[PDB]
Write a protein that binds this ligand. Structure first.
Ligand SMILES: Clc1cccc(COc2ccccc2CNCc2ccncc2)c1
Ligand SMILES: Clc1cccc(COc2ccccc2CNCc2ccncc2)c1
Ligand SMILES: Clc1cccc(COc2ccccc2CNCc2ccncc2)c1
Ligand SMILES: Clc1cccc(COc2ccccc2CNCc2ccncc2)c1
Lengths: 396, 396, 396, 396
């Protein structure tokens, strides 16, 4: 059992383990586009001896955090242990090696999407965004008198074929991802993949359509089996007017009974309707997970709420150092100290706080973060909150 | 079609309309206890001529708002229009008369639980609390190393018969309802009802059990049909230690596959487990709805977040006046003005902001509240937030 | 194995066989009311030797046929063979003895409700009415501009407790049953039973309500398990105005998603709505079955359509005689002949034609009735049609 | 927003709107065959300005009505409004323009298949045929002793591959459609389409088989997911013997539990079995809708029942003229009059009467057609009835 960077000869073994590990992995073409995002030395394999029994890699990503700050982010992905090689510490060894490489390379944060909720906490990843599925019974849906874009005259939204408006989607998405925490830069090869998945598949997905506004788009397709359900795969709106105009058009899908979308907890959709209850939360799950690799670089990088007055404390991350933390004027200074800790928490908890998806007070009530100062808790809650609600870009 | 306060002779007509309108209403005994909370002049009926074709009333309640302030609250309930008398403006006439009486009597707020989401907005009620059902697959559930009460030695929790510990439940609930926004004073007659519903019913509900801690209780019963589901009807914990100790005991129900509870979005339960995903959000809905009857009395009554610096603005409520609003040191002054409005919103929107369940920024993005100042929005969001997460007491 | 009229000593054996044969049969009280309708010599039992292994009886009924003619009708009921005594010819022997008694007593027709569709054809019973379940999604239901009773001002319909308006229900039903083919006289003891079943049952049915109009009523109750379904157990309307007014009130059950009723194929409900498709046919089955005991007495008794000109033919019923049949001026003369048959059919087929539920042309296309004259078929179809659509009264 | 006949340049916009509007529309090939049935000037489009936001067209059809009379029929189809352009009166404007063209061109009737039941009534279309799904549990099914084709010796039915017997199917269908009201001439291009859909589809429908008799055929295929269900897509029988022989063969599909077919309410199948209840009505819906374009041309064209004696009345169609209507000897004369109306009804109601699927008495009881003469109602019911039961040909 060796742990090595893979050679070109290892990749067929890795595509076999992939196919057996992930139902979405069709074959080598499934990996081509993503693989252009893996740097030299971004991948590890474990061999028996030899055949591939374990793999893991990271991609070079750009993640938007509160204050519209973009961090270089190591996106862990393609993580698999062969079913023959369970309980042999292979995931732990692979994560320790990648984390060493990611830290040495200078990434301040790593990120991933978890197959299960019980695995990545112990490696310092905290769930940092929240997926919220809304299902609308569009047969009852009526827009509130207050809702934008109710006026008579032309619609600002067009029904279009996705493959014919690639440039407009790219430009809108680029504007979205720079202004929203959770945003990820989407490279050309991932737009190539997305537009390929928009075609009908022989005995697979139905053809995708787009609704296009100058300041937003929605991609949606009818469900393969439930012919009265339209699933929105992605809606990116840069203005409230674009968000409301796109939902007016989706609620105009008169063939459908239901429209579903995977959105975020602060989606204003329910408030656009005379009956807020028509936007039913049908599913909720962790989205992006974060591991803070360098505590001071990450805490100094993001912006903080201007509404909380200057305060200083001492934060200890369980295996991640102790820091004098001063937050004022929406910025934070985070320097080494041996002064007594006022706040303690494991690394994973800091990742859960980092984009504003989880309140310090909520984590404190579970004893995940400990302090004897309730004023300090209120100040942390306020300071770490994000003005712009955190959203989930695309899984990887 | 007259609208009158009912006489004793009207009540059999009201119990018939009740039985036909609400599946929970068994018969007159269903109304006895609640009826002691209805003041003289708390009820209206509509007669055809004569038979009862419409009814509505309010109860005298005490509602806890942020800052641990308790307001006298008119609880609208027993609202019904006969199926013979739809679309005749009976609900509008009944709500206008009760609102006139409630305002004249000096209540600063009215509240209700809505049968449907599309009815009460137009009468100025905004959804103000959020019901969040968590279902735990307790067969996988393991407590995080950080979770309180993991130590060896005696449990602080006892399994008890509800009817034998009425005093302990009453005292714990009284402590809970005074410290949590959404809390409602529960009168002796409603404890009489609750303890009656805890017995097994011939072909009805199964017997309720209690888990009792010095600082919390849970009432739960196995589902009538799904024998592997335990439903927690109520869990009131005054400390984090009590909340964690009660969940350790519920996850010790080794007969069950699943434990469900109707809780609030900030329930720390998921954070107590090594897999946060095991606490699945299975249902979400509006809970308590609020109508602000007197804008200045309500805005001056509640406490505001100390973390936002003093600010002044001008708020217009659509049919509810314009006010100079100054918020500083966690308190607000709200005085008449004819100065230009900086913020506008319908009355229902203010009720949705009032307990901190909905952010001003979220309502602004749906255009439910309008301002040209994004700094003012961030300040309102921060100021109206509740330190202690808003919860739902008991429906009425 | 003897076949005898039962003595008082046989009835406990008959109630045991009943309880084991019919899930609705609770115990002896289940039989009390119906048993007052059984004449002396109306019942047969088969004994092993001795215990009761088979039973059957008939009740004295009054059945309305086209032309508003009321026939004395033998209603076969309480028919059971012990599961120990299958395939021993017990049903055949019991039906032969009762049919001999029914014919000797002078009944022109027998009738029953069949537990299965494959049993009673061979004993000469034809399905003569059609049960049609309509389920309305009342959340979409809007009345057509043409529909009666759309005017502003008082409703003609009242929501009432069934037990307090027994006289009004009795009088309306009596008017209904005399004007509709399929109508059955309902004796006081069956009104006693119906009003007993209207109360809530401990772990059983929910409480029944009534909608009362001068010229119609509906009895309905919410489903025991599906709390958004109201089931109409009976709607009797003597005028179109009463039918429409009652449906306006049922569609005013704003708590419900769906209203279901077991009605007849010509129920005008769908035509009252702007969307006829909202009245979904969810179930169809044979209702009342008829055996013509005396062909000429039955054919001369009922009225025929005035729109067909006088015609004469020769009808042979397979074991029931050959007759010269002359139909003109809505009346028929049916006399013995040995002239060549122009029409042949088994006895069961004549019962299926008798109330107008099945067309002669439809039965001819299945070769159930044979003739070489297509003009004669059109004439029979027209003549046997019922002006007033055939309905099903109450099962027995 | 212009309304125009489309140019060749408009058709890609129309195929996009089609794909987004109809789940069956795969792509341009989906329209090729049907499009040969659209005359010059048969189509309208609405453009924003420009892109296609609305479309509608009619095909040249031949519809069989009672008396075996074949009318030129405008078949409305491909009707779609973009989800961006709801509630802008586009459907009303498109239907007004096509109806003007259809009337000017000399069509006496228009027809369509409705996506929803609430749309086409207000444009004068009445549901005129009834789809009735029968599901047979063929494991219990036994043919009545009376049923044709029970004799020993060769079967008259052959199991064949549809594509190898196109000529026999074409000839049988042509005989069927000329003798049955509802029949439609099926052009060669629609036989090309039907025989293409009979092949297995990669992850789609299973291969279709045919049962072939000299005087009838059935096309059936096993369900894609329920492998014990055979769905009959089409059964056309010109004689009762062919209908019974084909059902004997379908009930010989010993692999299947259930056979389903979409047939008409008068299908004699149930009567062929010893248990009529085995032919369960599992679904009922409106089929073909009719708009009478020229009241007198349509009323004079169809044949009437010979069994009703000569009568005269005055019929007013709400926006369609008043006529002296004389019906005798199976023919009708319908001439202009200003004499007082004896019968009134909206245009849609006349379309519902026209093929005999709905009785005048049933529509009168919903007040859809008004008269003060009950004798006149019985005469209309009898006269408009169809000797040969109305069936549905193929949807378009
Ligand atoms: Cl060389 C390489 C690096 C990173 C990712 C991949 C592709 O990995 C997958 C492809 C299809 C299905 C599943 C996976 C693995 N699960 C994460 C994922 C999900 C969706 N899309 C992309 C990645 C290949
Ligand atoms: Cl005189 C009176 C005043 C206020 C309330 C009531 C009781 O009203 C009900 C009782 C049982 C079922 C349903 C209702 C009405 N829906 C609100 C509600 C729900 C649960 N518990 C209490 C009230 C009687
Ligand atoms: Cl002595 C006697 C004569 C006739 C009928 C009966 C009662 O028979 C039943 C009672 C309850 C359930 C089932 C049956 C038998 N199936 C027919 C039926 C159904 C509903 N209601 C009345 C009769 C007793
Ligand atoms: Cl240019 C043209 C004129 C008329 C019809 C059509 C084809 O229209 C469709 C094709 C496939 C699916 C759905 C539709 C539209 N719904 C009616 C329909 C249903 C089934 N078969 C034919 C028509 C194209």
């Amino acid at each position: 059992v060796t742990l090595c960077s893979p050679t070109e000869d290892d990749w067929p073994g890795m595509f076999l383990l992939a196919a057996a590990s992930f139902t979405d992995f069709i074959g080598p073409e499934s990996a081509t586009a993503w693989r252009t995002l893996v740097p030299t030395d971004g991948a590890v394999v474990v061999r028996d001896g030899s055949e591939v029994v374990g793999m893991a890699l990271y991609m070079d990503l750009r993640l938007t955090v509160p204050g519209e700050v973009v961090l270089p982010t190591a996106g862990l992905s393609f993580v698999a242990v062969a079913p023959t090689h369970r309980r042999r510490g292979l995931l732990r060894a692979m994560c320790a090696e990648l984390h060493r490489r990611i830290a040495d390379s200078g990434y301040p944060v790593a990120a991933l999407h978890a197959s299960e909720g019980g695995i990545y906490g112990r490696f310092g990843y905290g769930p940092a965004t929240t997926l919220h599925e809304l299902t609308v019974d569009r047969r009852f849906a009526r827009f509130h008198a207050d809702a934008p874009g109710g006026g008579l005259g032309g619609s600002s939204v067009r029904l279009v074929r996705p493959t014919e408006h690639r440039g407009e989607f790219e430009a809108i998405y680029e504007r979205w991802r720079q202004q929203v925490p959770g945003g990820l830069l989407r490279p050309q090869v991932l737009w190539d993949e997305l537009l390929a998945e928009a075609k009908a598949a022989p005995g697979g997905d139905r053809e995708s359509f787009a609704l296009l506004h100058p300041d937003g788009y929605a991609l949606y397709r009818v469900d393969r089996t439930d012919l009265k359900l339209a699933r929105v795969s992605e809606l990116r709106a840069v203005t409230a007017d674009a968000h409301c105009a796109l939902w007016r058009a989706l609620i105009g899908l008169d063939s459908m009974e239901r429209i579903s979308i995977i959105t975020h907890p602060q989606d204003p959709l329910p408030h656009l309707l005379t009956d807020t209850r028509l936007a039913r939360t049908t599913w909720r799950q962790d989205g992006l997970w974060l591991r803070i690799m360098n505590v001071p670089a990450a805490l100094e990088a993001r912006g903080y709420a201007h509404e909380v007055g200057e305060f200083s404390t001492v934060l200890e991350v369980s295996d991640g150092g102790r820091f004098a933390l001063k937050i004022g004027d929406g910025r934070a200074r985070c320097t080494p100290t041996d002064a007594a800790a006022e706040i303690e928490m494991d690394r994973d908890v800091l990742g859960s706080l980092y984009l504003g998806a989880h309140r310090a007070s909520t984590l404190a009530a579970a004893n995940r973060l400990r302090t004897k100062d309730s004023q300090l808790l209120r100040r942390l809650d306020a300071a770490f909150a994000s003005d712009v609600p955190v959203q989930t870009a695309f899984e990887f």
